């Protein structure tokens, strides 16, 4: 088995994101040191087997740090990641991956993110494919990653500043496994909007592995509200995610099209009921054939399958 680790620094917090192919994970341990010597690293956290992200806010400004993540199997196997530090090739813009998994090895890719653009291109297109360990540059997020057919997995991807959006589901099932997505007010792409855009129908967007949002965001997922040839049903399944920053709302479902958002394991910084609203119901429309409407935040309804127990203060 193997584990690949990536690091992203945000607001004096070091965020770690990793992917692992170990199938029987029991626990995961985070190690840190002030030097590159792995023999001197010391454990700073013991985590459950499901998360794929971690945040370290206990560092001093005058030091550099090295991190490693040890994925421990039920049978004592130590699957240790590469080291990452704060100390100062198939994955290229426009690439399409089909029916296979591509490990980007932690490289960075990006093009641009022009102000006021009406159309931007995807950096990576997946067709029943998986991409893992990739960083999207702050100034070149363009239209993120597209799942254009079948089942796609976006595993341990870091968006330094989401441009139009982070990922788009134009396929059957798009799964986000871990990853860290940053957005900011006045950042690239304008006012923060959605992270995950969902256009296909009879399809699902899945969020797990403690996908983490940092900075300021519009919403985590939106079933297209006014797409050409709009309709549904569109589904969202959230089992583990964290918002360590601010967000306007979490999910937007078009209840008239049968959309259903099923949410639990959601942690939000300083969460208060209604701040932010989690699942909101809307009326979706076909472009040019009517106006959308917002009905409001809902709990335990047909289309908003989220209970108060599904969301908590981080
Ligand atoms: Ca942005
Ligand atoms: Zn987009
Ligand atoms: Zn797109
Ligand atoms: Zn596409």
d(CA 295, CA 89): 46
- State which residues form the domain around 227: 89-314
Distance CA 239, CA 97 (A): 26
What's the total number of domains in the chain? 2
- The reply, when asked if residue 198 is annotated as ligand binding, is no
164 is in an annotated binding site: yes
Using the 3D structure, point to which of 64, 88, 112 is the last residue of a domain: 88
Q: Which ligand sits closest to the CA of 124?
A: 4
Q: Give CA–CA dist 52/281, Å, rounded.
A: 30
d(CA 110, CA 99): 23
159 and 105 assigned to the same domain: yes
Q: Which ligand lies nearest the alpha carbon of 138?
A: 1
User: Number of H helices and number of E strands within the chain?
Assistant: 0, 28
* Ligand 3 centroid distance, CA of 57 (Å): 34
Q: How far is the CA of 25 from the centre of ligand 3 (A)?
A: 34
C-alpha distances in angstroms, 225 versus 122, 231, 245, 292?
20, 9, 25, 7
CA dihedral 61, 52, 180, 259 (to 10 degrees): -150
Q: Nearest ligand, CA of residue 125?
A: 4
Q: How many CB atoms lie within 10 A of CB 91?
A: 21
Last residue of a domain, one of 58, 88, 118: 88
Task: Compute, in angstroms, the gap from residue 28 CA to the centroid of ligand 4.
Answer: 35
215 and 106, same structural domain? Answer: yes
Question: Which residues have a Cβ under 8 Å from the Cβ of 37 and sit 6 or more positions away?
Answer: none
180 and 199 assigned to the same domain: yes
Half-sphere exposure of 142 (CA within 13 A, CB side): 18
Are 260 and 296 contained in the same domain?
A: yes
182 is in an annotated binding site: no
In 3D space, the residue among 32, 72, 12, 19 whose CA is nearest the CA of residue 211 turns out to be 19
The residues, ordered by sequence, that sit 6+ positions from 78 with a Cβ below 8 Å of its Cβ are 70, 71, 72
Q: Which ligand is nearest to the CA of 170?
A: 4
> What is the resolution in angstroms?
1.5
């Amino acid at each position: 088995a193997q584990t690949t680790l990536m690091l992203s620094q945000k607001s004096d917090v070091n965020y770690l994101g990793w992917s692992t192919d170990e199938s029987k994970v029991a626990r995961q341990e985070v190690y840190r040191g002030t030097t590159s010597n792995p023999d001197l690293r010391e454990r700073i956290a013991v985590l459950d087997a499901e998360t794929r992200t971690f945040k370290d806010a206990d560092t001093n400004s005058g030091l550099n740090y090295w991190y490693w993540v040890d994925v421990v199997s039920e049978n004592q196997a130590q699957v240790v990641s590469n080291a990452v530090t704060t100390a100062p090739s198939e994955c290229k813009p426009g690439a399409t991956f089909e029916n296979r998994t591509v490990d980007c090895g932690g490289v960075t890719i990006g093009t641009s993110c022009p102000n006021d653009s009406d159309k931007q291109k995807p950096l990576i297109i997946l067709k029943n494919a998986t991409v893992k360990n990739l960083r999207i540059s702050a100034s070149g997020g363009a239209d993120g990653i597209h799942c254009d057919s079948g089942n796609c997995t976006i595993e341990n991807v870091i968006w330094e500043d989401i441009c139009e959006d982070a990922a788009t589901n134009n396929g059957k099932t798009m799964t986000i496994v871990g990853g860290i997505a940053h957005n900011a007010k006045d950042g690239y792409g304008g006012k923060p909007d959605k992270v995950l855009q969902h256009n296909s129908k009879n399809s699902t967007t899945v969020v797990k592995g403690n996908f983490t949002l940092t900075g300021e965001h519009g919403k985590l997922w939106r079933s297209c509200g006014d797409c050409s040839n709009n309709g549904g049903p569109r589904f969202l399944t959230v089992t583990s995610a964290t918002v360590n920053g601010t967000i306007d709302s979490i999910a937007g479902v078009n209840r008239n099209y049968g959309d259903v958002a099923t949410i639990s394991g959601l942690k939000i910084k300083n969460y208060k009921e209604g701040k932010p609203p989690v699942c909101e119901e809307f009326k979706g429309v076909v472009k040019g054939q009517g106006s959308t409407e917002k009905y409001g935040e809902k709990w335990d309804t047909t289309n908003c399958k989220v209970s108060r127990s599904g969301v908590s203060k981080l």
